[PDB]
Amino acid sequence: MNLEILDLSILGFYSLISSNSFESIAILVATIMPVITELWYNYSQLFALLYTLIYVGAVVILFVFILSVINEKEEYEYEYSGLFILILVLLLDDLDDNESNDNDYNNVYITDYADWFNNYNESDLSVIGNLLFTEYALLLLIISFILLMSIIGLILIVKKD
Amino acid sequence: QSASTLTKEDVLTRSVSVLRGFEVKTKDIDLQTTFVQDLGMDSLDLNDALVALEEEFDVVFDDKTANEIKTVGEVVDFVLANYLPTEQSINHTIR
Amino acid sequence: MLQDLFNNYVILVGILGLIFLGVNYFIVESPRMDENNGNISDYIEKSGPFECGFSSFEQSHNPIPIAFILVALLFLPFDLEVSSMLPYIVSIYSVGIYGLIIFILFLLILIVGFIYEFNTKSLSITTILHKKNKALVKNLY
Amino acid sequence: METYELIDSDPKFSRVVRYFRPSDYLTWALGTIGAPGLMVLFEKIEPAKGNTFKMPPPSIMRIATTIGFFGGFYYAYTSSTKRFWGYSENAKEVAKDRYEVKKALSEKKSPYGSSLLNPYQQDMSARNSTNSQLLLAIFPWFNVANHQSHGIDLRKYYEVRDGEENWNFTLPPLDQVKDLDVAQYKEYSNYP
Amino acid sequence: MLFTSLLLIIVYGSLVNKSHLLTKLINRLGLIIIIYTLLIHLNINTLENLSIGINMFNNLLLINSFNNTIIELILIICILYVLLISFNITGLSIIDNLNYSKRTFIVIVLFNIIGLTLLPLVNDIMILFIIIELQSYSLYLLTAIFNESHNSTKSALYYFIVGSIASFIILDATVSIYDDLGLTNIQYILMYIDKLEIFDLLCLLFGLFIKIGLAPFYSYSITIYSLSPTIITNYISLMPKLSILTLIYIIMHYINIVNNTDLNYVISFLILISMFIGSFGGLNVIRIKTLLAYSSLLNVSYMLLAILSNSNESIIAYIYYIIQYSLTHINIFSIILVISIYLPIMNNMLNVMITKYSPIEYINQLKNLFINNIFIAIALCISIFSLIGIPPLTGFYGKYLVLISGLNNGYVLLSIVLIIASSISTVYYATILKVLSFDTLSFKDIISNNLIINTSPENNNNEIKPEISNVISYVISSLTLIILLIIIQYENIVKGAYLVLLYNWV
Amino acid sequence: APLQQVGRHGGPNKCFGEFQRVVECMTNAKHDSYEPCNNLKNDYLECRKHKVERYKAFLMQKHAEELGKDPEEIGAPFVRKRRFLTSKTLGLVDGDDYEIGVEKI
Amino acid sequence: MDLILLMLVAVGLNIIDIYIMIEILIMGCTVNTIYSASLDNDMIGLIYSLIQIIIAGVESAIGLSILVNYNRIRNSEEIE
Amino acid sequence: PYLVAFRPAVLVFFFIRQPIGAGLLAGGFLFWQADRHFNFGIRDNIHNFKQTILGFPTQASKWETFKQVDAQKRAQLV
Amino acid sequence: SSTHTNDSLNSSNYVDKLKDTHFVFENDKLPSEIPDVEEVGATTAPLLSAAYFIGAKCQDYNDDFMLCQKEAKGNGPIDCLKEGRRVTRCASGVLKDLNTHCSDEFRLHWQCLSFSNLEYKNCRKAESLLNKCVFEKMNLVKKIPGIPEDRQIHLKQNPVLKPVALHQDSEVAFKKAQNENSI
Numbered sequence A: 001m002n003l004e005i006l007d008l009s010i011l012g013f014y015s016l017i018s019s020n021s022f023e024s025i026a027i028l029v030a031t032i033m034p035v036i037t038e039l040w041y042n043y044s045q046l047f048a049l050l051y052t053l054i055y056v057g058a059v060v061i062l063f064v065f066i067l068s069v070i071n072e073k074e075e076y077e078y079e080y081s082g083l084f085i086l087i088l089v090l091l092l093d094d095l096d097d098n099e100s101n102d103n104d105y106n107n108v109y110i111t112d113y114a115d116w117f118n119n120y121n122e123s124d125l126s127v128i129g130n131l132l133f134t135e136y137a138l139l140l141l142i143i144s145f146i147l148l149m150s151i152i153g154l155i156l157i158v159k160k161d
Numbered sequence B: 001q002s003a004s005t006l007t008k009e010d011v012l013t014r015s016v017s018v019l020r021g022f023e024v025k026t027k028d029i030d031l032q033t034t035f036v037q038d039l040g041m042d043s044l045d046l047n048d049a050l051v052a053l054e055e056e057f058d059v060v061f062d063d064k065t066a067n068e069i070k071t072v073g074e075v076v077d078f079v080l081a082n083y084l085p086t087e088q089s090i091n092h093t094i095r
Numbered sequence C: 001m002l003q004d005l006f007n008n009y010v011i012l013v014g015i016l017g018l019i020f021l022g023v024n025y026f027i028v029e030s031p032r033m034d035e036n037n038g039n040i041s042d043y044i045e046k047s048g049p050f051e052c053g054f055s056s057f058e059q060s061h062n063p064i065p066i067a068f069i070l071v072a073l074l075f076l077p078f079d080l081e082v083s084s085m086l087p088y089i090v091s092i093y094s095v096g097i098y099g100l101i102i103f104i105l106f107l108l109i110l111i112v113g114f115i116y117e118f119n120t121k122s123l124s125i126t127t128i129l130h131k132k133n134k135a136l137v138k139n140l141y
Numbered sequence D: 001m002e003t004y005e006l007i008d009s010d011p012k013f014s015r016v017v018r019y020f021r022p023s024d025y026l027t028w029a030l031g032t033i034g035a036p037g038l039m040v041l042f043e044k045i046e047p048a049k050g051n052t053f054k055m056p057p058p059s060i061m062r063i064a065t066t067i068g069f070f071g072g073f074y075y076a077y078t079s080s081t082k083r084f085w086g087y088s089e090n091a092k093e094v095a096k097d098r099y100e101v102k103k104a105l106s107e108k109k110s111p112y113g114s115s116l117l118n119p120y121q122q123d124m125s126a127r128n129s130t131n132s133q134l135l136l137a138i139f140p141w142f143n144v145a146n147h148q149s150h151g152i153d154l155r156k157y158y159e160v161r162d163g164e165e166n167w168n169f170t171l172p173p174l175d176q177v178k179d180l181d182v183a184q185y186k187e188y189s190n191y192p
Numbered sequence E: 001m002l003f004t005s006l007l008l009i010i011v012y013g014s015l016v017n018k019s020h021l022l023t024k025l026i027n028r029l030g031l032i033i034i035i036y037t038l039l040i041h042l043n044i045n046t047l048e049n050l051s052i053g054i055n056m057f058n059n060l061l062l063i064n065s066f067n068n069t070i071i072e073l074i075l076i077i078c079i080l081y082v083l084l085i086s087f088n089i090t091g092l093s094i095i096d097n098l099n100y101s102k103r104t105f106i107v108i109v110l111f112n113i114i115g116l117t118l119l120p121l122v123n124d125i126m127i128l129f130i131i132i133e134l135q136s137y138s139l140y141l142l143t144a145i146f147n148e149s150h151n152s153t154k155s156a157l158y159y160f161i162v163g164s165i166a167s168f169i170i171l172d173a174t175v176s177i178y179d180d181l182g183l184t185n186i187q188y189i190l191m192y193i194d195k196l197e198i199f200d201l202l203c204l205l206f207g208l209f210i211k212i213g214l215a216p217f218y219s220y221s222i223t224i225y226s227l228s229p230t231i232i233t234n235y236i237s238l239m240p241k242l243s244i245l246t247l248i249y250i251i252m253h254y255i256n257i258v259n260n261t262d263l264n265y266v267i268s269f270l271i272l273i274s275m276f277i278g279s280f281g282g283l284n285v286i287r288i289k290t291l292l293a294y295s296s297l298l299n300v301s302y303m304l305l306a307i308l309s310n311s312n313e314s315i316i317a318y319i320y321y322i323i324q325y326s327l328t329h330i331n332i333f334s335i336i337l338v339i340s341i342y343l344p345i346m347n348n349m350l351n352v353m354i355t356k357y358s359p360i361e362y363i364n365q366l367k368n369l370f371i372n373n374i375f376i377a378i379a380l381c382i383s384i385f386s387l388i389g390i391p392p393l394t395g396f397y398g399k400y401l402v403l404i405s406g407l408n409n410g411y412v413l414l415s416i417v418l419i420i421a422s423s424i425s426t427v428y429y430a431t432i433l434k435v436l437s438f439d440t441l442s443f444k445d446i447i448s449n450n451l452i453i454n455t456s457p458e459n460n461n462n463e464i465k466p467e468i469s470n471v472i473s474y475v476i477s478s479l480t481l482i483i484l485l486i487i488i489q490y491e492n493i494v495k496g497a498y499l500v501l502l503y504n505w506v
Numbered sequence F: 001a002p003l004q005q006v007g008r009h010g011g012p013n014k015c016f017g018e019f020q021r022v023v024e025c026m027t028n029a030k031h032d033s034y035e036p037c038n039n040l041k042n043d044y045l046e047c048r049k050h051k052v053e054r055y056k057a058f059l060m061q062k063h064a065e066e067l068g069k070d071p072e073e074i075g076a077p078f079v080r081k082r083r084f085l086t087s088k089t090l091g092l093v094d095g096d097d098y099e100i101g102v103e104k105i
Numbered sequence G: 001m002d003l004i005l006l007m008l009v010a011v012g013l014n015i016i017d018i019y020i021m022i023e024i025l026i027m028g029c030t031v032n033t034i035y036s037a038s039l040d041n042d043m044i045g046l047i048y049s050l051i052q053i054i055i056a057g058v059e060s061a062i063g064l065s066i067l068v069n070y071n072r073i074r075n076s077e078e079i080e
Numbered sequence H: 001p002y003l004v005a006f007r008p009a010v011l012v013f014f015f016i017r018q019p020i021g022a023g024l025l026a027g028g029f030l031f032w033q034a035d036r037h038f039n040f041g042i043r044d045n046i047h048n049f050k051q052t053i054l055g056f057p058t059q060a061s062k063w064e065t066f067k068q069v070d071a072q073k074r075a076q077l078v
Numbered sequence I: 001s002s003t004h005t006n007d008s009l010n011s012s013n014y015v016d017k018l019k020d021t022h023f024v025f026e027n028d029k030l031p032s033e034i035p036d037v038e039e040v041g042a043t044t045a046p047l048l049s050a051a052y053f054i055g056a057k058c059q060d061y062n063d064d065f066m067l068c069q070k071e072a073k074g075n076g077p078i079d080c081l082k083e084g085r086r087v088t089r090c091a092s093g094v095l096k097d098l099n100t101h102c103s104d105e106f107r108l109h110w111q112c113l114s115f116s117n118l119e120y121k122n123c124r125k126a127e128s129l130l131n132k133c134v135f136e137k138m139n140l141v142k143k144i145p146g147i148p149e150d151r152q153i154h155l156k157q158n159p160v161l162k163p164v165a166l167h168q169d170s171e172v173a174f175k176k177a178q179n180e181n182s183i
């Protein structure tokens, strides 16, 4: 019983009914959490933790910006919607969940055959660091160049003087 | 966006409706209708009408204007010249 | 590496948190057993906000100026810098001297932004009010 | 197309600087003093403020010289690089390069020199640094490693050219020269 | 040279005291840096050596003769732009001090120049995403450099959101290609050009089409260019098109290997709509920068017809058109900044508000320029007649070469439409000329002691004081005569375009 | 030549060999056109997605359905729960059907 | 349900809600990259995935700063 | 793995706050789980209808191609 | 490295549930044209204890099998079946000898490894007794290639890293050999 379906259905229901900005940043948290958990199992545990390390810090900075901008607008603005139409919209979106139309690729399972040739076994993060600092060191240096531009960019935009 | 959308006829029409909710002497109100004589308003009755007119158009008469206004037409002229829409939040305009 | 034991712990932790709330909801005596002031949803004098005794203006959705907003924004580029050091942590030996130099040059670029922040004084707390002494001068004729 | 002999497709940083001609230092010096001169020239063309000439402050002159110092060196570095690539007349550089390589070969030493980088890193470093001088105007990147991917054959250093008979250099076979790929994989084919 | 000198300028600017004079002198330092960068690039990069194409930095970047020409153009046009902020444009402190107020002006420009030059050189989908964001972020910062301006910050907010969506589309296209093939290097992808979904590259072009204001995504570009200051609009409306169009030509060069007819029709459909909006859009407008934004959209459509054809004549057409349009773009905005000194001073109906950021904001503010400055008015007239396409100006040959590539490749519908669009756009082009000169004979016997230039004090009443500074006037004079006298050296310049090869060889 | 298809341990993965043979064929001077390398390109794409092999499995399953063959009679035995990879299923001589320990290795 | 542009309703009616939408959209591309890289056993795709996370974080900081200054300008009299 | 611990709390708090809204979502979730678990084939039919109406190669379309080939190959042999 | 794959057992059953993993068995043996071989029956701990003894005894067969793989040009699994069976029999012979000549010393070593996280540094006392017994009865010596003979870590007198908890059986056996063998 894939419980990931139920969690996404609940998340999608609140996306259509979210009114204030606080409910929107809560939607973002309710989006990263299914991504991290579904990454923690199945595909990649490494990037599930990397998503938590980086995006959670961004969420707090996002949240503290909301406290400086909320201006009573959505605390009294009315919304109409309707319970019946919201469920109908979510039901129709539930009907089609096939992102690809290659039936053979989606219905036939495959296996891999492991080999003992790799006596030197290390984590994927070490291999990423091996290539990032040697093969693609230019990308790493340009990324630091972009980070430098952001630091200068933030100061000039925000600082009054 | 932030600009007046009033007209002399609409302002006069709503000014008459507000003034007809009081115990004025005459229901025939035009630009030249005076508060003191035609409407029979005293000191406090006139100030009640002025504040009531403030609530309708979301404007605030200054002290000098309110202490010297005589006719309804002067009220209409003040509303046209000074009315502005209230500034909205950042989300209302750019979204 | 088997993580079935870990999964059971995570399940228990989630259930454990609900036990604390469930116990508190089922242990407290009913309002009728207490002074019987009714449900909390009606006791508005209790469910209202706390303002040290005196009620004040209700500013729940008013804007809140933040004097460290630039420090908050500068956190994100520096957080990415620290995160980008993770690949070098577990690959320090394999990259050898070449990766060490690349890792130093990576930090030598971000140190320019660190120097820029030091000179621009962008880390200081911003204040609306300023305290300046005024020299008293006499316009003698 | 004016083409000359290829010396080194990825010359080392020290090799490029050593092979500087007297004109290369001359262009380096002109770049160093040109940038302060341009600030003087710009003020003469149109003063920064007012209508009369005003010398730029010494603080501007100091930073302008530093900018010109790196600008002049980069220009000189590019000019010397083309001689290794063969895009420019390099008969002086060919003769000097051949003498150094033959001397290293006679000593059973690699002309490229010993390296701290393993076989993968030496190849990786060459890929990053090769032809990087084409973007030297955008951002710097230099060959500061002793790799073996220089786009030349050491066999061409065995043939004797004019003016080299008196060098009296004896050249052993390449398989007996240390720190060469053809003389490392003796026991294992995957380990040097 | 750029990267090393940028770091020195960043540290130096934060150390010295905050003043308008130091900022202007630092701007001149940035001018020297770009000039030194041009000299270094010309010393090592030649057209003949780069004809084959040379890989760099583990094949992440690939430079050829086609790419090298645009890089040289980018450096040259950036030099002419820095002259605006490195020297006086009007000679008046109340007007010129805006350019000297922000110290990070020269720093942000140097950041963007690095992005602009490297973008056509990208040879990997990973570095493509990195560089396109490096260029995009620098444009957002420059749009928001005047953080005390409500319109500047609003435009940057609009620019950030639209560009971020385009970046997502670009990232989504590259990720989809990686999923199909598993490769990130473009040359490796070219091995499977016949086995990957070629419409995924159309998704990549859609993201690039947004960043150049192509229809139907034109609306944000017109709004941003009109609200942004004239000194900022002059840069952000031209520089992104120099690099992205060059990259689009390379991508379309790879797409034409499989020659997907459906791909061409979709791009033709967008070009057709852009010519309609570009021509009819500017007919009813009152702002000069709004008019130029529609003019920018129309001219990009003309270049895209050459790009879509992607033949030998297209290389000649695109290289010539992009060079001459940039010179015309600089000349027009240079004149607009200068002529602000002839604005009358009030001493009111319509309650017109003019700010220091955009002193020239309406087309009718150019009235009586024929009387105020006859040489500047003719220089503007030559530039406008070039945009129209009147021969033998530079603009005619640009449209002449574009028509050659379009009709040779069978784009009969687009060629006829582009000529109808040219005639429609001539209406609003002629309106600028009408405002300048059509009332000269009635206002010749008029008195104007209330102009902005009249507020400038005299030195000694005997010095012949020029109304315009030496540098900006000389640039206008040089660019105007190059546009006018292109027939003298037209044959040799096209011969230079003959030698610009994109893997043609033989 | 940049590295592509690198395994999780720094070496070539399963499909690098297919990719390497494609590059060698395309960059070989003896070839006049890229037609001889077409078969090598299909193998590399088959290595990653196995789309043709999955299609072959689709036909075999569909063909057996019309013949009335039971899937459990011509298929391969499988276990869905890792804790039930018992020693009886593994065929051990004294194999029991009690569940195996998979909590902590 | 996607072709009728249903996602335009799921996005809230605030400027910061547009920012959240962009972060989710970019995050979807990164998840897809991790999905392809993990199946292929390709660390190059994981290098791409890490770059996309770092670059997207830079984009959020720049956009927030513009939005912070935009909100500052309206409440900038500060006469008190 | 954080959703594992969070899921009991959010689900309980969902029904406590919106019991009817949560019931419809949970009921819809369970219905499509029963359809897939009991092999009722409701979702498969919708997927087949979508592929047929949008021009996609369908399960029956792929099988018909095999039948045409099989008929052709058999005729060639005989 | 605990990265999830499609080639072996993953970290938890939740990964199996998301992947819908089927643990598939095959009931068919190798075809009769391929000669049958006796598979090695040693588990992880005995194999790690005898790793250097298999290498010393079967070095030429290990190299020949691996040289067959490289020279097969992608057809390694099929072509090198003959070379594979030589390694399996040679490796089995080493384990058979260890169970007939050094069973007490062999079992003491790999039971220490099971007691100490299968780390070589934590079972030096048991390994030294095993190494001495194998040399005196099989003429096989543990050797670590690429380093000088005296700089081998297993022969180091005072290692920096030592086991936290002593193995009592190893301690008793080591003392029984110190006093008796070295009088």
Ligand SMILES: CCCCCCCCCCCCCCCCCC(=O)OC[C@H](COP(=O)(O)OCCN)OC(=O)CCCCCCCCCCCCCCCCC
Pocket: A007, A008, A010, A011, A014, A017, A019, A022, A023, A026, A027, A029, A030, A031, A033, A034, H006, H009, H010, H013, H014, H017, H018
């Ligand atoms: C983790 C255990 C402890 C937390 C359990 C709390 C359960 C509440 C629902 C959790 C979020 C599920 C997904 C919904 C997205 C966010 C929508 C939201 O705004 O919160 C729902 C909450 C319900 O109250 P309601 O009145 O119905 O909504 C307002 C109607 N105008 O309306 C509210 O605004 C109240 C918000 C309270 C603070 C919630 C902050 C977000 C919590 C996220 C943590 C869990 C991560 C997501 C897990 C489920 C993913 C689908």
Ligand SMILES: CCCCCCCCCCCCCCCCCC(=O)OC[C@H](COP(=O)(O)OCCN)OC(=O)CCCCCCCCCCCCCCCCC
Pocket: E272, E275, E276, E279, E417, E420, E421
């Ligand atoms: C002998 C020399 C000949 C030289 C000229 C040759 C061309 C002649 C063209 C003839 C057609 C235009 C002349 C007649 C149009 C009159 C327009 C008009 O009367 O009103 C506009 C009309 C709406 O009507 P309304 O605004 O209510 O006016 C009151 C009418 N009783 O609005 C409409 O309904 C018009 C239809 C909607 C707009 C359609 C636009 C689609 C494209 C039209 C073609 C443009 C092609 C441009 C190609 C380059 C750009 C791509």
Ligand SMILES: CCCCCCCCCCCCCCCCCC(=O)OC[C@H](COP(=O)(O)OCCN)OC(=O)CCCCCCCCCCCCCCCCC
Pocket: A096, G001, G003, H046, H049, H050, H053, H054, H055, H056
């Ligand atoms: C289980 C239910 C699942 C339902 C999934 C779809 C949800 C509802 C969406 C409405 C369907 C429209 C989209 C259909 C797919 C896109 C069109 C397409 O690709 O063609 C498919 C359809 C049949 O294709 P067919 O020829 O039979 O087979 C292909 C052979 N090569 O060819 C068609 O004729 C489809 C209809 C397309 C023509 C009408 C739409 C275009 C004209 C109106 C445009 C309105 C919007 C304009 C927006 C323009 C923006 C630039």
